């Protein structure tokens, strides 16, 4: 070759994973969440760096600082609310991503699914720490209750919770730590995302039908670059629709109250992206049992590849699993509802059944349904 | 016969990408101004007298 | 054998300007590229804003 | 001035009349058996709601 | 002792077979298979005819998926015509690998 | 070498004499 | 575990997506806060920056902010010899420091109204229905004098003196100062101190919505333009067979 | 290491395509959409809808009870007695 | 060759870009 | 290949630039500054993140903050003086790097 | 750059943020640097190719 810009620079060749790569033809709109997922990481990042251009990480100021970012600083208001709302998007998008590989057998790519899982739980920590930075009532108490949930571990726990906090409570110590970790996790995450993409570039993307598309492969550049741009268009639409017309709507917490350590919102709860886990945690009487169960809710994901029973990696051609699949999402929705509910009889009893129904759907129902379907097809 | 509006537009401005981009630069300018103007006006209309712009009179120069 | 080939009826998918089995597309399609490129130049001009 | 009138009107509607009967019995039940733990507050809580829904819509066209 | 029960499964099986829409796409049960290592070797063992056919049917399929359109009612795959053409090939491949595994015990 | 080095970097988080000063003193 | 009554979606000029704040309301309300409320509740993040936001001129607010620094002035902040003039000074803290503030109101701590609207669950509606909500204790109920009964407080009791009453103050123009009329104006000024960006943001919304209605359709066409070849495509299979 | 010349083997398949500038991008969209959207929604609805319907009932009942048991302060046990 | 006339419209674009955009 | 760990994972192959790579024989001690260069980048970072685990970025405090890192915080003193000094090294190393490039014409690349 | 007329808080927090984020960006660069260098290997004191000695 001569003057083929792409392969000339070795570096520029590496970028032809966007332009020349084999892309399946058929391909639901669902896939656009991978790309969108990465737009969200970049958005969050630029926003973060501008917010962290005018934020301070101290008990005294933090609150003020954020409050100053939204009032005297020029266009810091949208930057901050874009930031907050963004993260909602980032999660909404992540849970579409996981649903699509729960449905279509994308998780077949073991390697790629274990990086995903790492990705998902990294992004979870970042969102947990970033919400406390502001240092508002909700934040303050939420980080106490969660962190302390770690003190359920029998031998260490207790010592360990105090290490993490850098003291006996959540004072300055802890709030600067979160600022530092929040800032450096998304930069570590970016390398994982690229390691994720790496593996996934070795086998290409699955499809609705669940079958190899090597017989029908499209250039990513011509087609997918427009689709992606279009998906951004809608993505930003939702971000701005949220951030411009209903700033607070999706940010349940109304606690714009500076944290007072004796004071408590009797209604303490993580934002929407964590509710599922929360509800599953309350269903167990015992503290430790809850924490394990909390972990398993999320960590349960890596086990699905082993759980797969069918011969059709595609759910598309399998009724019964489509039916339980959907239920689990609606069970998931049910559990998110419990998260903002008084922890009283009515919700208790519901949540408990929901929590068992979630684990059933993942651990026992679906697996069986997989077999059945195989035996109906005579497979 | 004459060229459709688009064909005229085409051959004057969009054959050469140099002219095309020139266009776009120009366009982006002109557009911004009319949008704003028109978009602003629309918005102010919907809140007549609710905005300081409307209300400055009251305490201004006596 | 490779002569009993026909290209399929595209009449539904094509358009007004170049639907004329028996007439020139050269003096039709001058505009057709304009109109498509017009769309591009507009988008790129709004986005720029 | 404004507020005070519109409130009354609102409690003059057939659904306000109807649900004020629970307030009336409440108040008397409670005042006569004063030692009881019965809350008349809880009874009032239904009336108020229905009064106020109404109030809102009308009361607004009256202010500046 | 299956006379009434197993002459009725065909009814659920038939039900189920059209339920799963792959029916409609022009595909057949063998083309829906998860392509794994054993399936892969069975595939390779297919005749030009058998084999090229699978390529077209998946070609036509992935084309419909891409456009979200179903094939005409007249042109669908009918359960009574279950070409289990992969089965034969697929069996052996497994057969051979089971043996190999077993021969490796001790 | 590694052991102390690592240990110092973790105690750096454990609990600052600043805070710990007030601990247990009421 | 007491039922809590909830705020109406009270008719507000701004309830709507494009609706904006009514400054005259702001203006009025401001005075309400300043005369009715300055006494116990603070607004720390509010500077004497109404100018354009409240239609008070810079001379108007300068003056308005001068007298507040002459009486409450930086002598409560720690500027020994400070008097009239300055504009970067924030609204004057009712008391030296919170502990005092509870003593003046007997254990209770007058919440900073800066963010009340956005802080407490339920927005301006709640704030309006609280102030305007004060009814008779319920048969068989007991009340410590501070514990006035309010129909909309979580615990069904608040330490709040006559928040607002008819003819509490007087506005420049002549707006009829009704308990409620005043509260409509007070809430609005609060809405604003809670979210100063309220109008600009709605304004951008409009811009974002028109634009987005031009890009969404435009970019869609671009998507079909390209992909058309594929979706217009037809296939043929001709084995030698 | 090459993704385009190495995917798979395909014999005897002819493909016919047309250029973007010769066709229309929006092919009887209303017409196709209605029928196609209709036809697949109706093949989705049964598989998808249910569980959500379920949730809704659960939601509704679930909230009723709460408000009752809690608002029915006298619910548990009566007043007169 | 065509580079002058093309470099001159690329010239112009940058200029109008800056001018406007900045 | 089978069970050649290195090229199995594609990722782990990318790491064989360290182990398997063609490296010239003859090679002054000067080239160790590349590697050390990275060493320093990694040390500053680990150090930075811990200091920025107890530092505040305000007029009032910043001086105090550093002062507090070096006094009350356990092993914060070395971390900070390791971070300061490091950066010296980092530069001392950098300028060896560029010297070498200047002298042997590595800059041909 | 200063965020005002002098170097008060505004500037001080900016440097904190850019100091923090530069090194991460720089690591990407380093690796990019390494990438290019891996395509022609390390020169020597003699100045001649060593391909005959590796
Ligand atoms: C002096 C006393 C005043 C004045 C002039 C106003 N308030 Fe307001 N307020 C006061 C106290 C002592 C308390 C504490 C209540 C308690 O702990 O029971 C309050 C409380 C409020 C609230 C309640 C919010 C909540 O905690 O849920 C609100 C919304 C409130 N105060 C607002 C408010 C406004 C808008 C006023 C001007 C019209 C106002 N208060 C006057 C004491 C006092
Ligand atoms: C995708 C990863 C990220 C997620 C999920 C995330 C999320 C969040 C969230 C949920 C908050 C709380 C805001 C509020 O509710 O007020 C927050 C705040 C903050 N984040 Fe991020 N963030 C991410 C990346 C970053 C990055 C890369 C930076 C800096 C480079 C950053 C800097 C900040 C700062 C400084 C704040 C505090 C100011 C504020 O409250 O907005 N974040 N972040
Ligand atoms: C930071 C978050 C993430 C980013 C930025 C990201 C990025 C991407 C991108 C760009 C693609 C290619 C396009 C696509 O298939 O949509 C993709 C595919 C994939 N991702 Fe994600 N990812 C993220 C999180 C996850 C999670 C949480 C999982 C699952 C646990 C995961 C697993 C997968 C899988 C399995 C695929 C391949 C599916 C297929 O195309 O057949 N990813 N990822
Ligand atoms: C090679 C890249 C870097 C270099 C050259 C460098 C250099 C420096 C220098 C010269 C100082 C001043 C210290 C003094 O004399 O007191 C400093 C301070 C600081 N650096 Fe780094 N640094 C780098 C990377 C980082 C990173 C990656 C972080 C965070 C992860 C960081 C966080 C800090 C903090 C918080 C301070 C302030 C407290 C102090 O003075 O120690 N730096 N840095
Ligand atoms: C962030 C700072 C840097 C890092 C981490 C870094 C890293 C490396 C490493 C690991 C090597 C391979 C080993 C060696 O030859 O020593 C290398 C080689 C090289 N570096 Fe750097 N470097 C940095 C800065 C620079 C600078 C500032 C330049 C010149 C302006 C430079 C130019 C070179 C060249 C020319 C070589 C190849 C020499 C040869 O072997 O013929 N490096 N670098």
Short mmCIF file of C-alpha atoms in Angstrom, two decimals, chain A residues 11, chain J residues 18 34-35 37-42 45 90 94 97, chain K residues 22-38:
data_model
loop_
_atom_site.label_atom_id
_atom_site.label_comp_id
_atom_site.label_asym_id
_atom_site.label_seq_id
_atom_site.Cartn_x
_atom_site.Cartn_y
_atom_site.Cartn_z
CA UNK A 11 -2.38 4.40 14.92
CA UNK J 18 7.48 -6.52 27.09
CA UNK J 34 12.33 5.31 29.17
CA UNK J 35 11.05 2.67 31.61
CA UNK J 37 10.04 7.54 32.90
CA UNK J 38 6.99 5.43 33.17
CA UNK J 39 7.95 4.41 36.70
CA UNK J 40 7.80 8.03 37.71
CA UNK J 41 4.54 8.56 35.98
CA UNK J 42 2.99 5.70 37.93
CA UNK J 45 -0.08 9.12 40.23
CA UNK J 90 10.58 12.72 36.82
CA UNK J 94 13.04 13.30 31.22
CA UNK J 97 15.72 10.83 27.80
CA UNK K 22 -3.40 15.82 32.74
CA UNK K 23 -1.44 12.82 34.05
CA UNK K 24 -4.27 10.54 33.09
CA UNK K 25 -4.37 12.05 29.62
CA UNK K 26 -0.56 11.85 29.45
CA UNK K 27 -0.58 8.12 30.18
CA UNK K 28 -2.65 7.66 26.99
CA UNK K 29 -0.04 9.65 25.20
CA UNK K 30 2.82 7.57 26.61
CA UNK K 31 1.18 4.41 25.34
CA UNK K 32 0.58 6.07 21.98
CA UNK K 33 4.33 6.95 22.03
CA UNK K 34 5.23 3.39 22.86
CA UNK K 35 2.91 2.23 19.98
CA UNK K 36 4.84 4.12 17.30
CA UNK K 37 8.23 3.11 18.75
CA UNK K 38 7.25 -0.56 18.64
#
